[PDB]
Design a protein around this ligand. Structure first.
Ligand SMILES: [Mg+2]
Ligand SMILES: [Mg+2]
Ligand SMILES: [Mg+2]
Ligand SMILES: [Mg+2]
Ligand SMILES: [Mg+2]
Ligand SMILES: [Mg+2]
Ligand SMILES: [Mg+2]
Ligand SMILES: [Mg+2]
Ligand SMILES: [Mg+2]
Ligand SMILES: [Mg+2]
Ligand SMILES: [Mg+2]
Ligand SMILES: [Mg+2]
Ligand SMILES: [Mg+2]
Ligand SMILES: [Mg+2]
Ligand SMILES: [Mg+2]
Ligand SMILES: [Mg+2]
Ligand SMILES: [Zn+2]
Ligand SMILES: [Zn+2]
Ligand SMILES: [Zn+2]
Ligand SMILES: [Zn+2]
Lengths: 149, 64, 65, 198, 194, 129, 95
RNA sequence: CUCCGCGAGUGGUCGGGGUGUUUACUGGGCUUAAAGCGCCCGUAGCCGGCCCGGCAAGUCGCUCCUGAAAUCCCCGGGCUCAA
RNA sequence: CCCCGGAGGACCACCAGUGGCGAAAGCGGGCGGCCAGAACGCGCCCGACGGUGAGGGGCGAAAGCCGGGGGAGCAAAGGGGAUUAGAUACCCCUGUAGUCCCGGCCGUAAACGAUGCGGGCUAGCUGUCGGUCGGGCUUAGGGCCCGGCCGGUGGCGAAGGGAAACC
């Protein structure tokens, strides 16, 4: 839910106050960009790509080493998502919930979860239309947006 | 702060770490520094109840 | 974590650790709280297993960065 | 660091044994030193010694007659008794009569300028009257004690008979030395063991 | 009189000759005789007198509850309450408690429509409260007078205040609570961190 | 959701002063908070002001001198004129010699005394006494 | 005026309770607000001299719980009307 | 009978303001006194993180053209003062 | 009453708690599948995208209504046996809707924490739940104990507040 939740957690990562390049790093900025483009072509989304760089390759953060952001690097290197990552995730979640609701029409909890997800989709669409990252004629039609699932 | 206001009456003892005055009908506590005994330590009843620490201006002792 | 208004300078509680793979002997840099199965880049064996907290290491811990 | 009494005597009397509770106040002050894997709180014995020294200097500056030393703990009846017999202070073991400091029309109406309670969590009535009248208060506090209205505290194991007897003997010796009837070398006429109650 | 309580001993021995020193050094007055010794010019007034009853099997047992305000008219005021079966000792008890509860009152100017540096009014804006009567005292220009209720005027005049503006809230018809709230504000003049 | 850092910082200072603390830590901060603290320190209500460079915008550690009797941010931020300063003076302060209003003007954040000296007006921010 | 901070039942952060049926009754209440007094219980008490260690006669005891509403809990003396100060005392209900 | 208040006035009933912090901007309250919609999604509206650069709309300062006269506040003068 | 078999409808005893989940209503046997929403850990991604929300909505106990199925126990209405001055009640026997399932309507409740939602600051002590970190042990287990943080859930209680109960 969004309002009147039972709990209000604090879980989040605490980064250094001003991140810098690690002294122990064995990867140059250009090699970091090629590794990111490799993971993108393999198909991981940007959050997963960042986790992969941090875990497997020991890259703490793309921004200090390269001066850019991960989606900026992917955009420069010929990788352009259809929609923004969070909006696409919300739309896929809504499509999965609707597919479930097709065979289970009396799942009122699932209907409320779908309403929450669709409201989040609407807020994100309002923001993206305001900032120009999506076309101003974009409309959330789940029947015509099945291809994104 | 205060600009040329001459406020009457007895002045109150001032708390030596918070400036909470020992008001009439409320009894604070005034003693000498336990480590030295040179400076005076004044604790209003609020600071005594709250356990507010006090520091000697002369020595480096912090007491209840 | 704690409250940002209570901690003076918040810092990352995790750390980066160098590992030596026991099979081949390659050294690798790896996040301590690895949220995935981290493998050796050469032989391919598993070096770190993910948990809900600090990851479990199968390779020798050469030094914590 | 140089001790009022030897560390073997201290750690045999168990003065630095605290209750297994929590006390964020004492922890922030730094009187808590180490907690074992069974949850037992251990004080800093060096801080214990330094607070004994400063406390002895505190009681030394007051006339002994105007200092009231009180406990309701029966374990502290005897150590406070010999401490106070050797210093010359209004002593009180047993029940603190309410209104002794606030009711001047009472037969036992004492007038004091310093109060010394063995345990403030049990000797609450004396602490309450001291707060109401504005009398300075000294207390042998541990993890369970409430710190309100205590102008001076000595974090120590105020439960055991051995700890109480050793602490009171050390305080009596230091107060005698500060008053001047004893130089810094002599000891009391009786050992610490006579302070321990029976 | 026997100087019961050691402060009374010093006061009768003349080591303390003025009432200002007690409130300067935070000394607690436990006896009224110190007050009559150090303030011979103390005027006491009967602010309120209510009849009060307890129900019992044989009928109500009545007791007078008298409220008394004592003051020197020079910055010293106190108010006390006395319950007694008869009015005379009720007033005596109230006078004794007022004398025990006497306190200094800080005075001065501070009104925007005045510039005199005299003790005619309160030095700053102060508040007091007793149960539900809240009384805010505000400094006023000289010559305005006491702009409070009647019992508030009596308490302020006894405390030695000439001009003031009042702002009250709650049932002021509770005369005891109104008097206590006004006295509370006058005592709260000393809680201001100058 | 956090709305006004100035009112948040002022009420935090008031809470710490009520509890009789020696220092209050102020997070998040802005230049308005810094200039308000500067005016308070200039008039003595607030002691030393140390900046802390945490990554999340900065923090201010302020020393308290036992001088505040009541503090608070006037909200809404009312536009006040030089001829209108005095009624807000009487509205928020006790005594004609005690306390100060804080004003944001085109020459910067200052006290109501300095605003009346410069013969200017502006936006009311807070009060101290 | 609100008697008790418990609402008369230690229910917990929930909206509805499964609720039970009273013994010798049926007025009753949910799982909380009911009395669940336990007794040791055994058939034929003190015949252990004339049975048990005679013949072979192996007996059994069965701890038994009885559930009562407030009316029956007051009626069989399992609950008294304690004073206001003693209302917050934590005592076990005689097993 | 005598005393009290105002007096060429003094009373009755109405309407407005005060009363009234009982309309609350200053400045009320909503556990139990009247008062939190059974719960949640969200449109308009209102309220909104930090830093830097531009503008100068709100805002602030001065000035000008104005906001009829009478009325209102201050000052001087003339009706014997007064109005 | 006891035994041997079959059929049917409801519920999920103890464990079990001011224990958990959920926005509220509400949710208590096991296994499986399909979903949802949180907490915790994180040098993951976006970069203010947020709050509240008139109007407008959607969900919403019990009883009740519409149509279909089912019906063990209980049981409004009703019948009978008692009691009483009366007894159209309270007690006993019995008994139909209803209670259960499916589709819809109803849209109410002491729908209550009688406490709108969001965020910050302000002593503590103590039980318990989830995650996580440090130490010790180990029914060597996803285990137990102590200490810290984060997030819930109870108790007492600083400052403060209140007409007071009290928070
Ligand atoms: Mg919006
Ligand atoms: Mg514990
Ligand atoms: Mg309910
Ligand atoms: Mg009202
Ligand atoms: Mg009501
Ligand atoms: Mg509600
Ligand atoms: Mg309604
Ligand atoms: Mg309703
Ligand atoms: Mg402009
Ligand atoms: Mg909303
Ligand atoms: Mg609506
Ligand atoms: Mg139904
Ligand atoms: Mg039937
Ligand atoms: Mg039947
Ligand atoms: Mg309600
Ligand atoms: Mg109320
Ligand atoms: Zn010193
Ligand atoms: Zn390898
Ligand atoms: Zn004046
Ligand atoms: Zn029953």
């Amino acid at each position: 839910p969004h309002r009147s939740r039972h709990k209000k957690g604090r879980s989040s990562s605490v980064r250094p106050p001003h991140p810098t390049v690690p002294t122990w790093i064995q990867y140059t900025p250009e090699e970091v960009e090629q590794l990111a483009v490799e993971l993108a072509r393999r198909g991981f989304p940007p959050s997963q790509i960042g986790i992969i760089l941090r875990d497997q390759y020991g890259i703490p953060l793309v921004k200090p080493i390269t001066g850019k952001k991960l989606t900026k690097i992917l955009e420069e290197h010929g990788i352009k998502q259809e929609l923004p990552e969070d909006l696409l995730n919300l739309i896929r979640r809504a499509l999965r919930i609707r597919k479930h609701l097709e065979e289970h029409p009396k799942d009122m909890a699932s209907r409320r979860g779908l309403q929450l997800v669709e409201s989040k989709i609407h807020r994100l669409i309002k923001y993206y239309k305001r900032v120009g990252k999506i076309p101003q004629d974009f409309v959330y039609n789940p029947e015509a947006l099945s291809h994104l699932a | 702060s205060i600009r040329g206001a001459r406020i009457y009456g007895p002045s109150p003892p001032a708390d030596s770490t918070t400036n909470w005055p020992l008001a009439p009908l409320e009894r604070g506590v005034v003693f000498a520094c336990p480590n030295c005994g040179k400076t005076t330590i004044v604790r209003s009843a609020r600071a005594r109840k709250l356990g507010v620490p006090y520091r000697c201006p002369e020595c480096g002792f912090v007491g209840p | 974590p704690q409250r940002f208004s209570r901690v003076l300078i918040p810092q990352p509680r995790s750390r980066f650790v160098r590992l030596r793979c026991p099979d081949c002997g390659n050294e690798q840099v790896t996040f301590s709280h690895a949220a995935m199965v981290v493998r050796c880049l050469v032989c391919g064996r598993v070096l770190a297993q993910p948990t809900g907290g600090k990851a479990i290491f199968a390779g020798h811990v050469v030094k914590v960065l | 660091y140089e001790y009022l009494v030897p560390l073997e005597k201290y750690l045999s009397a168990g003065v630095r044994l605290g209750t297994r509770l929590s006390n964020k106040y004492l922890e922030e002050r730094g009187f808590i030193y180490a907690v074992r894997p069974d949850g037992l709180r251990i004080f800093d014995i060096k801080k214990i010694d330094e607070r004994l020294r400063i406390a002895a200097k505190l009681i030394a500056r007051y006339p002994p007659d105007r200092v009231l030393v009180h406990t309701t703990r029966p374990y502290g009846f005897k150590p406070v008794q010999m401490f106070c017999k050797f210093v010359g202070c209004k002593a009180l073991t047993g029940r603190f009569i309410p209104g002794m400091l606030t009711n001047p029309n009472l037969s036992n109406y004492l007038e004091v300028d310093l109060l010394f309670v063995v345990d403030p969590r049990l000797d609450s009535q004396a602490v309450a009257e001291a707060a109401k009248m504005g009398i300075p208060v000294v207390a042998l506090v541990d993890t369970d004690t409430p710190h309100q209205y205590i102008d001076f505290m000595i974090p120590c194991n105020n439960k055991g008979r051995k700890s109480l007897a050793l602490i009171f003997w050390v305080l009596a010796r230091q107060v005698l030395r500060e008053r001047g009837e004893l130089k810094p070398d002599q000891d009391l006429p009786v050992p610490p063991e006579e302070f321990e109650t029976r | 009189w026997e100087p019961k309580t050691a402060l009374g001993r010093m006061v009768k021995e003349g080591k303390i000759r003025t009432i200002d020193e007690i409130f300067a050094n935070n000394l607690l007055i436990k006896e009224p005789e110190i007050v009559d010794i150090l303030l011979p010019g103390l005027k006491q007034e009967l602010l309120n007198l209510n009849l009060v009853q307890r129900q019992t099997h044989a009928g109500e047992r009545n007791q007078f509850q008298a409220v008394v305000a004592v003051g020197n008219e020079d910055g010293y005021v106190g108010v006390g309450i006395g319950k007694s079966r008869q009015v005379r000792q009720a007033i005596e008890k109230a006078t004794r408690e007022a004398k025990l509860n006497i306190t200094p009152v800080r005075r001065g100017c501070g009104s925007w429509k005045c510039s005199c540096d005299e003790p005619h009014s309160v030095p700053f804006v102060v508040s007091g409260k007793s149960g539900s009567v809240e009384v805010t005292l505000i400094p006023a220009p000289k010559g305005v007078g006491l702009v409070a209720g009647d019992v508030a005027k009596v308490v302020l005049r006894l405390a030695g205040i000439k001009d003031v503006w009042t702002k009250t809230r709650g049932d002021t018809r509770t005369t005891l609570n109104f008097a206590l709230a006004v006295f509370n504000a006058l005592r709260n003049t000393y809680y201001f961190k100058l | 959701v956090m709305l006004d850092l100035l009112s948040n910082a002022l009420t935090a200072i008031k809470n710490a002063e009520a509890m009789g603390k020696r220092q209050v830590v102020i997070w998040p901060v802005n230049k308005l908070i810094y200039y308000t603290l500067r005016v308070l320190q200039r008039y003595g209500y607030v002691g030393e002001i140390e900046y802390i460079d945490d990554g999340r915008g900065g923090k201010y550690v302020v020393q308290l001198l036992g001088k505040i009797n009541d503090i608070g941010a006037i909200r809404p931020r009312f536009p006040v004129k030089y001829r209108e300063i005095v009624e807000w003076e009487q509205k928020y302060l006790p005594a004609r010699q005690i306390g100060i209003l804080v004003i944001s003007t085109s020459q910067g954040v200052m006290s109501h005394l300095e605003a009346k000296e410069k013969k200017i007006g502006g936006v009311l921010l807070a009060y101290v006494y | 005026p609100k008697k008790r901070k418990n609402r008369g039942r230690k229910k917990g952060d929930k909206g509805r309770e499964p609720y039970v049926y009273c013994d010798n009754c049926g007025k009753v209440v949910p799982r909380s607000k009911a009395i669940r007094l336990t007794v040791p219980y055994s058939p034929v008490p003190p015949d252990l001299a004339r049975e048990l260690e005679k013949q072979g006669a192996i007996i059994s005891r069965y701890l038994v719980t009885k559930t009562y509403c407030i009316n029956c809990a007051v009626f069989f003396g399992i609950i008294k009307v304690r004073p206001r100060e003693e209302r917050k005392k934590r005592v076990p209900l005689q097993q």
